[PDB]
Assembly symmetry: C2
Homo-oligomer: 148 residues x 2
């Protein structure tokens, strides 16, 4: 606990990438001691899973993908802020997709953490920034990825 997680890659959103790299570029100009996040994403849910349950996760993901039009709407990124040692963005528009895939996962006997604040990691620092992107999700990007 945890173990793997279900990921939503943001690298595809050329709109989001534009202002994301711009914010990272800004971190560099200030000369902060940071590690820049290379492949920006949003972790939809953590999992505690054994390899003999991978297929379940597939079907769980498969189910959401099929009914994807239900989860259309706007994704918004805003309010940069610290989260321990990470600079992070607030993500909003994945709440419905989150709680659905958690049900399905538990109904398949996948422990998936029900209880969740959706963020996007920007930079890891060793020890008032402004950002806003409103992304039309509209009309498959979901991965099982292992930690880490």
């Amino acid at each position: 606990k945890p173990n793997h997680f279900i990921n939503f890659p943001l690298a595809q959103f050329s709109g989001f990438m534009g202002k994301y790299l711009k914010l990272q570029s800004q971190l560099v100009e200030m000369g902060l001691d940071c590690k820049l996040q290379k492949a920006p994403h949003v972790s939809i849910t953590l999992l505690d899973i054994k390899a003999d349950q991978y297929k379940q996760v597939e079907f769980a993901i498969q189910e959401i993908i099929d009914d994807l039009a239900a989860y259309e709407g706007d994704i918004v990124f805003d309010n940069p802020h610290m989260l321990g040692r990470c600079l992070v963005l607030d993500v909003r528009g994945f709440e419905e997709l989150h709680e659905d895939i958690v049900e399905i996962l538990r109904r398949r006997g996948c422990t998936a953490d029900q209880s969740w604040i959706p963020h996007c990691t920007v930079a890891q620092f060793d020890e008032g920034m402004q950002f806003y992107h409103k992304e039309p999700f509209y009309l498959a990007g979901l991965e099982l990825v292992k930690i880490g």
Copy 2:
């Protein structure tokens, strides 16, 4: 093929401003490259055994004592590809290089190569022999030692690999 003598540039806030702005442009274009964190100019490479450290420190110190002979302008320009790294050309360390090499040799340290020495400042290293977009950098740092600052600063260093 062993050790090198280093001139760190991080204390030059003027140079640093422009060098971060250049690195920032790299990040903004989204390039697969690893930025350098402690910019520096390699002054010479040497083949040194760990019992020649004392004699290296002494050469470095011998130059530092005559640092006023090298006062002038470090000029940084021409961001260009040099192998896999993006790299700035550096000018103003030519005598300092010659001299510390001479010192190091009579101290019995083997330094430099027979090939022409060309001094650079590394901006970023790429993954696979990438491309020089029309990158543009120019800066002139004054290189002088202070007189009303007995707090002095940084300078030459001997580093591993």
